[PDB]
Design goal:
This is part of a larger assembly, with 1 copy of chain A (139 residues), 2 copies of chain B and 1 copy of chain D (550 residues). Chain A is an alpha+beta fold. Chain A is built from 5 helices and 7 strands. In chain A, α2 packs antiparallel against α4 and α2 crosses α5. Chain D is built from 31 helices and no strands. Classes of the chains: A alpha+beta (139), B mainly alpha (242), D mainly alpha (550). Chain B: This is Coatomer subunit beta.
């Protein structure tokens, strides 16, 4: 039981606006931020549903001032990961009552924290239905 | 000066790294090292300077950063090659900062002083052993410890490892294997040509001044005089860059 | 223009001279054909970069020029004249050449072979 | 954003009389923020905050309940007397609504230990069977965590877990089958029964397929007693649902280790299954591949080739281009190597930095891995030396040299010699060490050592200690192996460079004295060819494989 390695929603530098680690491989801030900077550097300023970083398929999207991440295994493809990443974007948008930017996330830090935990649970994909997550969470 | 040597030693004493002033010490290793070599070249030039240099060198060591010791140990060890059983006194100071370690340089240099100097001291299993089971960076450490560890007088040390344990150690560190000083840090030598073997063959007479490592250690390769750059560096290190 | 060992060394470091050719009629030492020809492609054989002995003793010339081409020109002419039982290729010399973007490097490379003109009207 | 001390502290009021769901929930949000923003809690204040929060469980508000689940899991390990919160979680857990149901089981089970395992079971059995994915999946992941604390309690849940497995709902099934496989295991055979039950089925759950493919990938013919085939009628060997990841995972295992052989509607020996998905968008990355395939990656390789090769050449986008190199690498093999090498040559032109180092390593690495001759490998290794001149390293001097002395040595030294003409001291410690080590060791009669010596002599002056020390010792060995050489050793060693620097001096004093002074019993003995300091494997090729599409 494992698909998603980690989820990060990063500003346009790779610094932690947010990350919640569905791996046990980053718990300390220094390394959680390093990871975040690492994934953001590869993936950014080339938007696609694919990136390969650290031998893992990284699926990412972007907004005005954020890049949104799911990191998962590379034995899969973008599309499986993408379903998590689409939930992540979508659910935060509907939850916060505003599209994902740094402003929406900061506006409601609580909605963001709770919403992401419903999407991924210890690296298993707990939820992937944006609607379900949003009802499930209370602001 | 006398030539250049006298006033260069005074001048170098001010420039070279100390525990006295921290406006003359720096944690960048090459500059520190170079400054030790400049001070030390004055001795090699002129005798009077040997007597001044060795106590100042011990102050250089007293900084007690891994690296700070390290640079210090590296030149002084060259000085001993020139200055045979004259710098017996330094060995005990030189061991001290060898234990907190994160670099190659400290291991290299210390192992050489402690190694050549063995008759003078008796500490050596204890000093070497904390480092031998400690880590840092150890490539070049191998080369320098390989020619070095046994040397001088066959049985004139003992703390829980006499000079013979040292020859055992010296051989293990070079490329062999042996329980001694709670095993050495690494065994696999530095740059491809060097290898263990020459010294392994060597130590005909176990770490004793004869025709062994000790000989080599208490002798200096070719001519070594002046500031012609034969165990020397040619004035004060900062002026030379220009 | 000319260099000393320090200027040559600095320029060696400054920009690459990996480019080499072996030029025939560099059988001879630095002084003879090689100097005269090198002169005509406004070059000059100066200081050494050699290390001679009983096993070593290729003749080495450090060359310099400052071309009106927006480049300098440098080269080292190594003359492979046997001082060993196994020479490179016997007599001949390999000229390792450069210029500042190695556009004159090539001039050095071939203008150290031969060079002669005459008529008798 | 926040300060961990102030927020951990003000939480202590809960422990007394104030419960204020708004204030406490905020304070909790702040805790989650301290972690999220990246901060580390202080233990005294954390321990205190944890005992305080449990009072807050009395008030049942969905946002406060939510805060409470995340905060207790994060604060659980950096807190004491946490056991009090179990009751409060059970109280919450039985309360109907997904907000409580799912999030509580997960928070409770994390804190729960074998003593406490028994308590959660009634509520767990009720939560696992749910076809409402939140409650069931959280309960299924929760059970996975609990297998640690106590196995036996979790095992009883196999029936509820199986019940969830029968859903075609993606989560409920993924979690149900995945968890079951872990749980019921006491022997292979009982797990195998669980898998066969779902196995005949054409799911619409890609995740279940994937987790199961992995269990399945090996030949299982004892599924539900016994059966006459390794058969998997769920995509692993079948292709009932198309979707490029599932299709890729399945196709690479089945082809040369049947999970079942090829069907007209489900290729499973033939190379096809990957290939029909192969022309695609970004999606293509799974599809285009290969791995194994009948009988080789090469007939397979041709399909996909248009896709992998055009992206790899065109895209100087890192994200696309990486997928394109991995995909080229996958369609590769022994045969493919002609093609793979031209492409990899081409690739650095798109991304050229580290990627440059990697392609010049790759072309050599591929030649060693997939044979196009060992010589060609050396010639590629020259091209690597030429292009980078510094991203070769120390491990390269040892690996190039060891590899080289299989055949190349006379040539390699000579090539190296030419290569050394490059750049006097920016070429690095390593190249000088390679020409030096090789010229020392071979003792050229293939070319005159005098060029080599002259080249090395200059490099030593202005380059690092380790090479200058290397140069004296090499010279000494060079002396012992070849008598001729001794005159050059003497001009070099008297110099302030190859001796009388620092490290260089010490080694030199030894090496010199042994050659000069002593018998050279030692020197003779020491040179056995004049070999390296260690002989590892062939490190480059694996390194290179991962490193290129990063």
């Amino acid at each position: 039981l494992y698909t998603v390695k980690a989820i990060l929603i990063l500003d346009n530098d790779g610094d932690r606006l947010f990350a919640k680690y569905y791996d046990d491989t980053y718990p300390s801030v220094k390394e959680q931020k390093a990871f975040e900077k690492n994934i953001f550097n590869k993936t950014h300023r080339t938007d696609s549903e694919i990136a390969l970083l650290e031998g893992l398929t990284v699926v990412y999207k972007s907004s005005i001032d954020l890049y949104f991440y799911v990191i998962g295994s590379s034995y899969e493809n973008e599309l499986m990961l993408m379903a998590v990443l689409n939930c992540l974007f979508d659910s935060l948008s509907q939850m916060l009552r505003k599209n994902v930017e740094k402003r929406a996330l900061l506006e409601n830090m609580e909605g963001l924290f709770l919403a992401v935990d419903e999407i991924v649970d210890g690296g298993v994909i707990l939820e992937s239905d944006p609607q379900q997550v949003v009802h499930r969470v209370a602001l | 000066s006398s030539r250049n040597v006298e006033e260069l030693v005074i001048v170098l004493k001010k420039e070279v790294i100390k525990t006295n002033n921290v406006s003359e010490h720096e944690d960048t290793d090459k500059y520190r090292q170079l400054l030790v070599r400049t001070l030390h070249s004055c001795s090699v030039r002129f005798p009077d300077m040997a007597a001044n240099v060795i106590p100042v060198l011990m102050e250089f060591l007293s900084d007690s950063n891994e690296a700070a010791a390290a640079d210090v140990l590296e030149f002084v060890r060259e000085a001993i090659q020139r200055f045979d059983n004259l710098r017996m006194l330094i060995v005990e100071k030189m061991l001290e900062v060898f234990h907190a370690i994160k670099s190659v340089k400290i291991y290299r240099g210390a192992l050489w002083i402690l190694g050549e100097y063995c008759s003078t001291k008796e500490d050596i299993q204890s000093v070497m052993t904390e480092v031998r089971r400690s880590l840092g960076e150890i490539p070049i450490v191998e080369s320098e410890i390989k020619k070095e560890a046994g040397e001088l007088k066959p049985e004139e040390e003992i703390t829980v490892g006499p000079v013979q344990k040292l020859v055992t150690e010296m051989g293990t560190y070079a490329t062999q294997s042996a329980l001694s000083s709670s095993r050495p840090t690494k065994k696999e030598e530095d740059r491809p040509p060097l290898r263990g073997f020459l010294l392994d063959g060597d130590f005909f007479v176990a770490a004793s001044l004869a025709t062994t490592l000790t000989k080599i250690a208490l002798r200096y390769v070719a001519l070594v005089q002046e500031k012609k750059k034969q165990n020397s560096f040619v004035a004060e290190a900062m002026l030379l860059m220009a | 223009a000319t260099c000393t060992d320090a200027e040559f060394r600095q320029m060696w470091a400054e920009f690459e001279w990996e480019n080499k050719v072996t030029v025939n009629t560099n059988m001879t030492d630095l002084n003879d054909y090689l100097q005269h020809i090198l002169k005509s492609t406004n070059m000059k054989c100066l200081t050494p970069e050699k290390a001679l002995s009983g096993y070593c003793g290729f003749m080495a010339a450090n060359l310099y020029a400052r071309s009106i081409f927006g480049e300098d020109a440098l080269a080292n002419v190594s003359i492979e004249k046997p001082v060993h039982q196994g020479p490179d290729a016997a007599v001949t010399g390999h000229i390792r050449i450069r210029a500042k973007s190695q556009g004159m490097a090539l001039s050095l490379g071939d203008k150290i072979n031969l060079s002669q003109k005459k008529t008798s009207l | 954003h926040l300060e961990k001390s102030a927020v951990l502290q003000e939480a202590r009021v809960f422990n007394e009389t104030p419960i204020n769901p708004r204030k406490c929930a905020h304070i909790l949000t702040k805790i989650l923020y301290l972690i999220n923003q990246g901060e580390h809690l202080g233990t005294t204040e954390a321990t205190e905050a944890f005992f305080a929060m449990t009072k807050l469980f009395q008030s049942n508000d969905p946002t406060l309940r939510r805060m409470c689940y995340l905060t207790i899991k994060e604060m659980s390990c950096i807190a004491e007397d946490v056991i009090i919160v179990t009751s409060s979680l059970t109280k919450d857990m039985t309360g109907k609504e997904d907000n409580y149901r799912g999030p509580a089981v997960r928070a409770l089970c994390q804190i729960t230990d074998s003593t406490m395992l028994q308590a959660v079971e009634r509520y767990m059995k009720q939560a696992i069977v749910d076809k409402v994915p939140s409650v069931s999946s959280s309960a299924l992941v929760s059970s996975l965590h609990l297998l640690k604390c106590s196995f036996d309690v979790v095992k009883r849940w196999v029936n509820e877990a199986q019940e969830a497995a029968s859903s075609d709902n993606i989560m409920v099934q993924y979690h149900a089958l995945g968890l079951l496989y872990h749980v019921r295991k006491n022997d292979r055979l009982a797990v195998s029964k669980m898998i066969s039950k779902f196995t005949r089925h054409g799911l619409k759950s890609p995740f279940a397929y994937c987790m199961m493919i992995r269990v399945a990938s090996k030949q299982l013919e004892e599924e539900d007693g016994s059966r006459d085939s390794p058969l998997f009628d769920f995509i692993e060997s079948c292709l009932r649902n198309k979707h490029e990841m599932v299709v890729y995972e399945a196709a690479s295992a089945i082809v040369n280790l049947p999970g079942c052989s090829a069907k007209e509607l489900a290729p499973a020996v033939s190379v096809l299954q990957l290939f029909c998905s192969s022309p695609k968008a970004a999606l293509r990355y799974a599809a285009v591949r290969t791995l194994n395939k009948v009988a080789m990656k090469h007939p397979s390789a041709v399909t996909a080739c248009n896709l992998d090769l055009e992206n790899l050449v065109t895209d100087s986008n890192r994200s696309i281009a990486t997928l394109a190199i991995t995909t080229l690498l996958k369609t590769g093999s022994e045969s493919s190597i002609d093609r793979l090498m031209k492409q990899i040559s081409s690739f650095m032109s798109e991304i050229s930095d580290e990627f440059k180092v990697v392609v010049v390593q790759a072309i050599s690495a591929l030649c060693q891995k997939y044979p196009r001759k060992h010589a060609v490998l050396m010639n590629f290794l020259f091209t690597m030396l030429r292009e980078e001149g510094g991203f070769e390293y120390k491990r390269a001097i040892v690996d190039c040299i060891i590899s080289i002395i299989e055949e190349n040595s006379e040539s390699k030294e000579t090539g190296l010699s030419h290569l050394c003409e490059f750049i006097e001291d920016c070429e690095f410690t390593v190249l000088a060490t390679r020409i030096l080590h090789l010229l020392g060791q071979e003792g050229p009669k293939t070319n005159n050592p005098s060029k080599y010596i002259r080249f090395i002599y200059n490099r030593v002056v202005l380059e690092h200690e380790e090479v200058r020390a290397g140069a004296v010792s090499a010279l000494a060995k060079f002396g012992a192996q070849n008598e001729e050489m001794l005159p050059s050793i003497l001009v070099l060693l008297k110099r302030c460079v190859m001796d009388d620097d620092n490290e260089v001096r010490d080694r030199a004093t030894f090496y010199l004295n042994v050659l000069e002074q002593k018998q050279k019993a030692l020197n003779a003995g020491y040179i056995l060819n004049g070999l390296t300091v260690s002989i590892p494997g062939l490190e480059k090729a694996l390194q290179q494989y991962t490193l290129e599409p990063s």
